[PDB]
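P.,

For your records, the input lines for the assembly:
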Amino acid sequence: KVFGRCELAAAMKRHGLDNYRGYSLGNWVCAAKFESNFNTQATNRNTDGSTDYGILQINSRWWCNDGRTPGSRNLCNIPCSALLSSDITASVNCAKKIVSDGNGMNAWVAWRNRCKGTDVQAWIRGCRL
Ligand SMILES: [Au+]
Ligand SMILES: [Cl-]
Ligand SMILES: [Cl-]
Ligand SMILES: [Cl-]
Ligand code: NA
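C-alpha cells returned:
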C-alpha cells in the first residue's frame, strides 16, 4: 500500500506517533517519505546482509526477524513481514521502541540527512488533523 501524505499523517497520529519522544508528526512523515516513499511494501538490502523493511525501513539486525540475518536480534519481537503490512500498527510500535533507544530519530539515517532541521511541518501542511 502506498499512502497519501495526509493519509499517512492521520494513521500515524491515531497510533500515537504524533510527538512521541518529542518528535512532531511532520518529522515522522518526512521520514516515511524518504525511507519508503510511503510504500508499506518497501524492502531495501544492506551491504551487511541485513534488510530494511516497511514504511520506516526497520532493520533486521535488531528490530525484526527475517530468519536470514546471521547473529541479529528481533527486539520488536515480530517477523519482518509484519512490517510490510497495509496496516501500519506494527511498524509504528517498533518505531516507538527504536526511537526510544537513546539516539532518537537519528536511528533513521535518511531522517538525519534529509529531515533533521528542515521545515518538517510542511509535511502536514493542509492535512485535516
Ligand atoms: Au494504522
Ligand atoms: Cl536471522
Ligand atoms: Cl493503517
Ligand atoms: Cl531526542
Ligand atoms: Na531476527
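Two observations worth noting. The longest strand covers residues 43-45. The radius of gyration is 14 Å.

Regards
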